[PDB]
Structures are given as C-alpha cells and as structure tokens.
Design an enzyme around this catalytic site. Structure first.
Site, PDB file in Angstrom:
ATOM      1  N   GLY A  21      39.214  16.210  43.157  1.00  0.00           N
ATOM      2  CA  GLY A  21      38.916  15.127  42.701  1.00  0.00           C
ATOM      3  C   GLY A  21      37.784  14.893  41.381  1.00  0.00           C
ATOM      4  N   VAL A  24      43.118  15.384  42.624  1.00  0.00           N
ATOM      5  CA  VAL A  24      43.429  16.873  42.884  1.00  0.00           C
ATOM      6  C   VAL A  24      43.313  17.278  44.047  1.00  0.00           C
ATOM      7  N   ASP A 129      43.173  22.193  23.361  1.00  0.00           N
ATOM      8  CA  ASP A 129      42.332  21.297  24.066  1.00  0.00           C
ATOM      9  C   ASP A 129      41.249  22.410  24.551  1.00  0.00           C
ATOM     10  OD1 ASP A 129      40.931  19.138  25.139  1.00  0.00           O
ATOM     11  OD2 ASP A 129      42.141  18.702  26.625  1.00  0.00           O
TER      12      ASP A 129
END
Ligand SMILES: Cc1nc(Nc2ncc(C(=O)Nc3c(C)cccc3Cl)s2)cc(N2CCN(CCO)CC2)n1
Ligand SMILES: [Ca+2]
Length: 282
Positions: A21, A24, A129
C-alpha cells in the site's frame, strides 16, 4: 498462450498474504513458493492501458527490469503479478536511512540503469518516468526498473505537413527516434542527483513553477561538487544536455569512466543490508 490469461483462475496459482500500500498486495505462489507484488484492479473500457503495460513488461525480460510473473483477467478483476523486490524503492531507503547514497552506490545504480535503458531503447520502449521511487532493490543488491504506467499510456496513444508550424514539427520529431529515447537519459541524470542529495533539483518550488524552471534554467549540477569525483560531475554534465540532439545514448554513457570500470554490485548489497537492519530498530 497469450499474455493476459483468460483460461486459468488466478486463485488456483496465487494466494494473497498481506498488503504493502490504489492498493498493492503481497501474494504467494502455491506451486513454486515465489513471492510477488500483486495488483487486483476491478474496471472492465480503459483497461487497455494496463494490457499494454503488461505487454511491455512481458517483452522486457531483463535482470534489471521487474519480472512479470503473470497476468490474469477473471470475472471482473485484472490480476497483475510482479516479482517481489524486498529492498523496496531507493527513495524509501534514503528516507529510512535519513541520508543520500554514496558515490559507489550511485555508480552501481547508474551502471545497471544504463544496461536496462540500453535494452529498453533497443526495443524502442521509453520509460518516461525515471526517478528513485521507480528503482526497486533486491536483497542481492540489484536494481529493478519499475512502473511502466507512463510508458504504456504513451505507447497506447501512439498505437491508436507543408502547413505545420516549426514547434509542432519538433514535438512530432521528439515523439520518434532517435530523439524520444533521450528523455530517459536526462531523467537518469536527475535521478542520480536525487540519489546524491535525497530530493531532486528544484524541490523547493511547487510543480507548476518547476516546469518553467526546467525549461528556462541551465542544467542542474551537484550542490557540493567537492564531495564528488570529476567523473560523476562530468557524467552529469554530458547527460544533462538540454539539446536532445547532442545528448548521448545509454550505449555511449556505458563507456564513460564513471561506470565503465564498475564490475561489482557490493556497494548496493551493503546499502540494502544497512536499510533492512535500520527497519528493525524499534
Ligand atoms: C511498496 C513496496 N513494494 C515493494 N516491492 C515491490 N516489488 C515490485 C513492485 C511493483 O512492481 N509494483 C507495482 C505493481 C505491482 C503494479 C504497478 C506499478 C508498480 Cl510500481 S513493488 C516492497 C516494499 N517493502 C515494504 C517496506 N519495506 C520493508 C519493511 O519496512 C521494504 C519492502 N514495499
Ligand atoms: Ca519523497
């Protein structure tokens, strides 16, 4: 057998066993025992973003790229299972240890990042990214480039002239080779600086003011250049070249003296050992 599996049931092979998290989840493989970072997304029109992301990962089998362990779409929910990287992200490590990476640690990251980027660019895939938050660590002290969301969204867009203005020609030229992949080389440079100084350049400024600052300002340099070798500074000098025409490739940068003599990941294995011991402090 296609990359998104319709036929098999994910619950047969995988079982969720915690959180990390949006969410996830940590997931155990019942056959092998292997651990995975899981994503169970319920959507059912724009899940083609995720499908293209999965097809990028599946094509990119590399030591320094996160491994796709499986992709299943099963009654409403899309399961993406990725190799678990127990060291976590490099920015989290810096936060936990309350410091930046040393140069030998940065040299390893840089070297392995260049091997991955040289590979991705060979496949005409651009990450778009890069940042310390998307560089994940294993306990053996290797990186894994993670989060191909931006890469996938960009690729989906591209998948699906006499009167054109010059700025518009340049922005369709920057969308193709051999200019598009240069964006990752700049981002690598900034990621290195982030690893040296914890925060990236211009972190004091808010995100709207930052875009202008990157457009208008000269390339960033290391704040305290005495602390770093001339090789590191020279690597940044050429990598953070504002003109993508003259900015070197990953392949070229692999021959630079900052990374060319790197033969061991030891410095990173140590970093991960230190970080994991630090987590245990309580
Ligand atoms: C958040 C997090 N992830 C970890 N490892 C990962 N491996 C692979 C990841 C990955 O592929 N994610 C992902 C997915 C799945 C889909 C889309 C996009 C992405 Cl980015 S994430 C480890 C970790 N740890 C907890 C905390 N620390 C220990 C105690 O303190 C360190 C360990 N925490
Ligand atoms: Ca942060």
């Amino acid at each position: 057998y296609e990359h998104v599996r319709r036929d098999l049931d994910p619950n047969e092979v995988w079982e969720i066993v915690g959180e990390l998290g949006g969410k996830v989840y940590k997931a155990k493989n019942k056959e092998t025992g292997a651990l995975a970072a899981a994503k169970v997304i319920e959507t059912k029109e724009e899940l083609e973003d995720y499908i293209v992301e999965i097809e990028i990962l599946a094509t990119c089998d590399h030591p320094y790229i996160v491994k796709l362990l499986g992709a299943y779409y099963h009654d409403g929910k899309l399961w993406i299972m990725i190799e678990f990287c127990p060291g976590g992200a490099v920015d989290a490590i810096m936060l936990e240890l309350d410091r930046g990476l040393t140069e030998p640690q940065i040299q390893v990251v840089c070297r392995q990042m260049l091997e991955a980027l040289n590979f991705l660019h060979s496949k005409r895939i651009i990450h778009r990214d890069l940042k310390a938050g998307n560089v994940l660590m294993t306990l053996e002290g290797d990186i894994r480039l993670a989060d191909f969301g931006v890469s996938a969204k960009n690729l989906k867009t591209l998948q699906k002239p006499y009167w054109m203005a010059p700025e518009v020609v340049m922005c369709e030229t920057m969308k193709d080779t051999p200019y598009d992949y240069k964006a990752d080389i700049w981002s690598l440079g900034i990621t290195l600086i982030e690893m040296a100084q914890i925060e990236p350049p211009h972190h004091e400024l808010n995100p709207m003011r930052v875009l202008l600052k990157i457009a208008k300002s000269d390339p960033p340099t290391l704040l305290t250049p005495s602390k770093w070798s001339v090789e590191f500074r020279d690597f940044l000098k050429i990598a953070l070249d504002k003109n993508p025409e003259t900015r070197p490739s990953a392949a070229q940068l692999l021959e630079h003296p900052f990374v060319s003599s790197i033969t061991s990941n030891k410095a990173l294995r140590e970093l991960v050992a230190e970080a994991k011991a630090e987590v245990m402090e309580e």
